[PDB]
Amino acid sequence: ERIVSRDIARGYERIPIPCVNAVDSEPCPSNYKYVSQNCVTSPMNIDRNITHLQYCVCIDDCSSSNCMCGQLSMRCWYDKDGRLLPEFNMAEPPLIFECNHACSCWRNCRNRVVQNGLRARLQLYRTRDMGWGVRSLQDIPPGTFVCEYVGELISDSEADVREEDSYLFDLDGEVYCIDARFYGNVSRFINHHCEPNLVPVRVFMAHQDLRFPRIAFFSTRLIEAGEQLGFDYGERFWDIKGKLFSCRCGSPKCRHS
Amino acid sequence: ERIVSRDIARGYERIPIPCVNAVDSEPCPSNYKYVSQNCVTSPMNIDRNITHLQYCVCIDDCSSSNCMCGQLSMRCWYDKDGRLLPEFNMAEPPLIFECNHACSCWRNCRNRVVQNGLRARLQLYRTRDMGWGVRSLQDIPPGTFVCEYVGELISDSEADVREEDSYLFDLDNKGEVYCIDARFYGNVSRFINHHCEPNLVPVRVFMAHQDLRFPRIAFFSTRLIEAGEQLGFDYGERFWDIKGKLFSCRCGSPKCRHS
Ligand SMILES: C[S@@+](CC[C@H](N)C(=O)[O-])C[C@H]1O[C@@H](n2cnc3c(N)ncnc32)[C@H](O)[C@@H]1O
Ligand SMILES: C[S@@+](CC[C@H](N)C(=O)[O-])C[C@H]1O[C@@H](n2cnc3c(N)ncnc32)[C@H](O)[C@@H]1O
Ligand SMILES: [Cl-]
Ligand SMILES: [Cl-]
Ligand SMILES: [Cl-]
Ligand SMILES: [Zn+2]
Ligand SMILES: [Zn+2]
Ligand SMILES: [Zn+2]
Ligand SMILES: [Zn+2]
Ligand SMILES: [Zn+2]
Ligand SMILES: [Zn+2]
Ligand SMILES: [Zn+2]
Ligand SMILES: [Zn+2]
């Protein structure tokens, strides 16, 4: 196992994300630019008018059902450790509205998780037969925020003319996409699994422009130290790529083999 | 001395900014919203195209002569402690271009100070005759980043119809010019009083974008500021051209230019 980078994020995350290769001679991938938060090339005109934000007037730590931001989320789904409650619907997640800079509450209130960024110890590594992948170095309890799907925000019309579509996440009115091909974070290396240990959740933080949810992966179960991360890429991906290759996730319940 | 808030920023800064009143019974100011970063109401159309960033290719910590970002700034003006070099021209500051997310360097490189946020221990306090002011609770060495002038980014045409103009900071022409209004949304800097021999100087800084219409305004210390001293900057001639007919400067400098 060769260490090919001590940190693919170059210090932009809380902790480093090293890259190792125990399989072959490929060096650390360098065909893209690591960015820790979303970017644009062509302008997106995201609504950032501060007076358009809904916000709460809580005098506590936003643990009561009176919190407007919890109400927008149906309820606040976070426990005091920032983990999703047992009742959270992993099969059909709601939208999460975290507290923002317009709220009366403090920056340490209960309804702030994704806005605090990536915390888990992750590693980019060479898989046996699925190129690069991402693993957790430590145990991750169920319902824990793992990482955001970060990249270049683009229009559907722009996605329609992109040659490489293997690093797209659809935000689907007007519809948009996150393309992690040229600019992306660690999430661009996460492989597909049919019984995934991550689920994507649509989250609003500093803006509430519903065209532009941010995509937060939360653990669907206990992820043991060493395990590869995976999420369900969905049907659009497989309708297209199923023509070219079959799923190698190896699940007994694999739906694309 | 009554402590009226342990932190006006509600935990949004690296350190608390308490408010005290040892003069009268005025409560902690509450007729504005504290924001730690600039905001907009009407859209500003800031150029955030990542391919429009100029960036560096440094293989080190950006302390060499060769850093592109330093070159844009004339040279990198920051020493190893994040303080402006002695040669920095306080009377005529250059534009500073800090490193950014398009640069090849690491997040801990030398050319990153303002983007790391407010670090000095500050306090909002009631002054005897100039309302609220801000003081340092610690010694601040010369050339230290103290705080950013944060508020609502507005056009000159919007500034033209803003009745309350006592919390405005004018930005740079280009035939297009903007302002930061800290009246409704602002950080601690909205409370800093004017001084004719100021211990702070505003420096125009670029970080995540390089849209020259929207420099960010970073106050740096012009000298050693002693623990307890009130912070001050020079509001400039436009402020005093307008407000001079309503009141005179009470900074108390023996060289006061607006008394
Ligand atoms: C977003 S990338 C993931 C990172 C990729 N392995 C790499 O090396 O860059 C998606 C691509 O990885 C491969 N891949 C991901 N999951 C897979 C799976 N379950 N079975 C087969 N190939 C997969 C496919 O080539 C797919 O188009
Ligand atoms: C940006 S505010 C500063 C905070 C203000 N003291 C407060 O209590 O909100 C500007 C106002 O403070 C007062 N002020 C600031 N510096 C002053 C000075 N040197 N002399 C007289 N008044 C001053 C004036 O009323 C001025 O319009
Ligand atoms: Cl958190
Ligand atoms: Cl954002
Ligand atoms: Cl910015
Ligand atoms: Zn609340
Ligand atoms: Zn809250
Ligand atoms: Zn809230
Ligand atoms: Zn499968
Ligand atoms: Zn450099
Ligand atoms: Zn740089
Ligand atoms: Zn640098
Ligand atoms: Zn004076």
From Swiss-Prot, chain A:
Q: Annotated region Interaction with histone H3: where?
A: 156-172, 233-236
Q: Where is the SET domain?
A: 120-234
Q: What is this protein called?
A: Histone-lysine N-methyltransferase EHMT1
Subunit structure and binding partners: Heterodimer; heterodimerizes with EHMT2. Interacts with WIZ and EHMT2. Part of the E2F6.com-1 complex in G0 phase composed of E2F6, MGA, MAX, TFDP1, CBX3, BAT8, EHMT1, RING1, RNF2, MBLR, L3MBTL2 and YAF2. Interacts (via ANK repeats) with RELA (when monomethylated at 'Lys-310'). Interacts with MPHOSPH8. Interacts with CDYL. Interacts with REST only in the presence of CDYL. Part of a complex containing at least CDYL, REST, WIZ, SETB1, EHMT1 and EHMT2. Interacts with BAZ2B.
Record: residues binding Zn(2+) 3: C62, C99, C105, C109
Residue sites binding Zn(2+) 1 per the record: C56, C58, C62, C67
Residue numbers for the site described as Histone H3K9me binding?
Y149
Which annotated residues bind Zn(2+) 2? C56, C69, C99, C103
Subcellular localization, as worded in the UniProt entry: Nucleus; Chromosome
Q: What is the effect of changing Y167F?
A: In a breast cancer sample; somatic mutation
For domains, the record's comment is: The ANK repeats recognize and bind RELA subunit of NF-kappa-B, when RELA is monomethylated at 'Lys-310'. They also specifically recognize and bind H3K9me1 and H3K9me2. The SET domain mediates interaction with WIZ.
Functionally, this protein is described as follows: Histone methyltransferase that specifically mono- and dimethylates 'Lys-9' of histone H3 (H3K9me1 and H3K9me2, respectively) in euchromatin. H3K9me represents a specific tag for epigenetic transcriptional repression by recruiting HP1 proteins to methylated histones. Also weakly methylates 'Lys-27' of histone H3 (H3K27me). Also required for DNA methylation, the histone methyltransferase activity is not required for DNA methylation, suggesting that these 2 activities function independently. Probably targeted to histone H3 by different DNA-binding proteins like E2F6, MGA, MAX and/or DP1.
Give the tissue specificity.
Widely expressed.
- Binding of Zn(2+) 4: at which residues? C194, C247, C249, C254
